[PDB]
Amino acid sequence: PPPTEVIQLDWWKNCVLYQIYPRSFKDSDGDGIGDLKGIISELKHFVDAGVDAIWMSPIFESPMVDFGYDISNFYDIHYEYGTMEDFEELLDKAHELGLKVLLDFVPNHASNESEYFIKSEAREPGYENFFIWADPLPNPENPGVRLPPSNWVSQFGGSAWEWSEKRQQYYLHQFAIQQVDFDFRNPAVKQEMFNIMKFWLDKGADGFRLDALPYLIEADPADHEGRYPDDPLSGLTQFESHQLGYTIPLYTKDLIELYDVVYEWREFLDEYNKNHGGDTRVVFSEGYANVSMTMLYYGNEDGAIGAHFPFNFDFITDLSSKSNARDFVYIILRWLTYMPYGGIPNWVFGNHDNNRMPTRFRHDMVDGLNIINMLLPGVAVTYQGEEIGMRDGYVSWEDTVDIEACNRGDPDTYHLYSRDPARTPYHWDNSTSAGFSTSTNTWLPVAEDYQEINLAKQKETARSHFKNYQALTKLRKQATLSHGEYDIRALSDRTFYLVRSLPTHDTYVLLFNVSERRDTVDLGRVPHLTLPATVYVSSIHSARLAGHEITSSQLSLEAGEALVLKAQPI
Amino acid sequence: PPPTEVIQLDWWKNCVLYQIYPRSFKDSDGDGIGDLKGIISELKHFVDAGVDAIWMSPIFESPMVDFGYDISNFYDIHYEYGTMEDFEELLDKAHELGLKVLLDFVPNHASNESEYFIKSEAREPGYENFFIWADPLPNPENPGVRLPPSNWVSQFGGSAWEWSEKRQQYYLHQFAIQQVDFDFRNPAVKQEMFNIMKFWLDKGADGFRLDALPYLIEADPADHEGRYPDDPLSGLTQFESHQLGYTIPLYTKDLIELYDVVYEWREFLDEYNKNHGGDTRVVFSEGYANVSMTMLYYGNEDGAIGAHFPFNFDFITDLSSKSNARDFVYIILRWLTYMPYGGIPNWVFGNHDNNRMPTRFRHDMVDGLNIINMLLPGVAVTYQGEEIGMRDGYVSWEDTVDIEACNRGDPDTYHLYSRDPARTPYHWDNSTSAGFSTSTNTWLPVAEDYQEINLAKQKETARSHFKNYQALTKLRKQATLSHGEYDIRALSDRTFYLVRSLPTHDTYVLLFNVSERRDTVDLGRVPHLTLPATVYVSSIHSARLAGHEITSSQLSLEAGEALVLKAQPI
Ligand SMILES: OC[C@H]1NC[C@H](O)[C@@H](O)[C@@H]1O
Ligand SMILES: OC[C@H]1NC[C@H](O)[C@@H](O)[C@@H]1O
Ligand SMILES: [Ca+2]
Ligand SMILES: [Ca+2]
Ligand SMILES: [Mg+2]
Ligand SMILES: [Mg+2]
């Protein structure tokens, strides 16, 4: 029977989404700082890699206390990365290449150097109630010692309440002191969020990645007899009252009210898309929360529709080099079991806040992990460097610039908190600073292994992480990956299969030995696999090359070894 | 295409195992206490139900502090239940009816009224080191102030160490003061466990349920500078030092050494089966532990073999009336993902230690839960009463006899700890004491609902929980259920499917609405299901009767409604 026809999916339902960290991607001007002209000079890389969409970490005006997540002007570009003119040139050239471009929208908080905050702190009409402002807690026992409104702890260490001398009140900061929480019960705040998104959509952005959504809304003091209620204590003896972990964020995180805001954003975006046409503009949400609270981002049982998807962080939070094949299968099944009917699944192996994929797992697992990302149904998310297997760089206490490490850590402990090792400059080639910059003075130090692990080397050599990444993004054009069913089970503690299958179309099978030992499996146990079958992709140190025939039902895999087999249609 | 033959499995790989609680099954002599003559009189009940195997809770000589789990003589019957001759008659008539009979083996501990203990406490030669005896912890702060060897906490509340005035040492009890922990590093103790099992196998027992295995072995003082190490503190503020929950059982539970004793028991049982022939004799292990520690009961990576299976308690520990269809699917997949290849799966919905199935879930979910139990691959475990949907009985403080409630509870709290509600006499009929006894004076009070919920009523009326149970045990004879593949997914937050399929044999599909609301599903989404299909079983509250034709691909299910559909072969 000739192959069945498939209906084309909207671009966002099966895109490869690549996360750029602009400060570390490409420095065009020799200051050791990545910039918009550098991204423009390398837009061709995304076409070459088979990436469909890029999301940039924040590039808006920022005092850089949290490297861009502390925004002083939501309507202009950070001078170190470029100008508004450079941003419009990036959108033009990305669009001319067929790429979608998403921006990082940071709705929870503004810089204390924003006009919003300067005006609010001065009680300017229209801005007085823009942020969460609170009087000290009544201290009847002992006045003249001022108490914060509650025991709430900041994500970056210390009290989430900061005293303003000028306003004689505390403001809330869930992040750095310099990151002030907006009041999302203020209709003027909600309108300003629509105004910001409309500004950037009108410039031509294809959508947003929405930062820190679990922290949008905190308890209304009207519900607690006019005080901010204390979060419960954890009881964990390793954390004192200034340390993140001391409290359970019952009154400060995952409040049901935050989802109404996200559903209002989607209604806004739907109307925008209806009134503008062209490619669907989308929102992807960031939030670390339990399965129930994460799936509420998609929408709810009463028919509300939220983000196009919430990010799936499961390969960051629940899988590591300690995981066996049964763990891999059980965690993969969690998103696919709990995601609502019609939801688009997505897979995230890394980001700028977490250790790099090959450091969390092992160096010999890079290809297997990139195959899982590309072969599971839905959307693959790649963090800058995963396409070449980059590793965490070494960063000394002296070179550490992450506010989280500087606030929570010291020269002995910093490494426990710092996100800097996942933010080291991208390895283009084996030239000075790995081709990231013409300067030796980079904003973070270049990882020592850049001579071994760089993009130019992997394009030159016959087998490489990059060549495997290219073969996998190319495979996603096949109807079996865009529309095919999936079947996933462990064959042993060491090896699992993933089968994509679609009647009249080729079958594709991942076999992956995630263990540190060899494993022999019976391919007779793999559904929809008729032999012989052809190796489409192999791990860079597999005995099997692309084009190799698998004829025997008994298969011995090395530690880390992964294969994609192409087999006849069912 | 005529139906393929399947090779018949050994009896234990797909049996329906029924747990009898002898004290509450059937009183033959009017003392309000269930007995062995009682059981003999109703062995026909297991043939009628489609039960293959019965396991009895303990029937050995016991002061009854823990209603049989405190054993004073491992080689004879508790007088209230009957005589050795009654036991021999039970095995004889049970075997005549084709039934297998398992005994509850309690290797962790003996009654302090056991000869073992009386001899041990007196330091008689060969018994001195039969139990864990320890000196008080040296007190350098105030010498000769008596301290327990460690902070360890009993499962029934209070210290796990009891002072012997006679011996001037502490003994270990993980359970009641009256349950004394054997020393499993003493080869004489290990020999005595073989001696007990051989005795009962020689009488013709078909094997054992093994009690309390996670607690077998505790830290050797020789590895902790010649003291028993304190268990870590939990930090949970609701637990004082005398309360279960105060400690994390790092040195008192799940020690790797316990598994070596289990593998030794399986090696002895394999040698017994080999030398005696006839039906395979088996061991099913009891232990509440995490998934890694649970799966080690089957065997280990070195090829050691343990229990035929450890009990799967997931429908007790991890599902309830709070669970939705996605929770049901994700918990069912846990055993099937983690169980070693070649392992036999099992499903437990209740026991004498936990609230009854219809109380933990809902009254309208009974049929759907019994369907899951019978239609999942492997072994179905039924607890006394689940075949008629018995609910927890009310038991006042005054009528409470469970040591766990009496030790950990009081008149206001006892309901939090007591197991008695799940142990109320079995509802045979609507006669005095629901036909459990001719006396109104029963050892626990007969539940108030026995007029509504009894076996006789369910055998007479056209649709019942018991008739459904009978229809499901009969279905287990079909090749599709013994040898079929499985496929399980959620269609919604309310409804899931379970498909058993096998080429050339009939297809069986469970559809179950686990919610309190009506749900409409598309049957086109269900793999291997071609319409029309026939209702084989329906919940007693379903508008569909057995024999009903499902023709439409749109299906509305009322709250708690479950159907088993019979559909043409694949
Ligand atoms: O904006 C606060 C916080 N949100 C999440 C971002 O990914 C992280 O880098 C940032 O520090
Ligand atoms: O023997 C101790 C303990 N083990 C588990 C048994 O099921 C329970 O009833 C008993 O109290
Ligand atoms: Ca907030
Ligand atoms: Ca013990
Ligand atoms: Mg630059
Ligand atoms: Mg299938």
Ligand SMILES: [Mg+2]
């Ligand atoms: Mg009696």
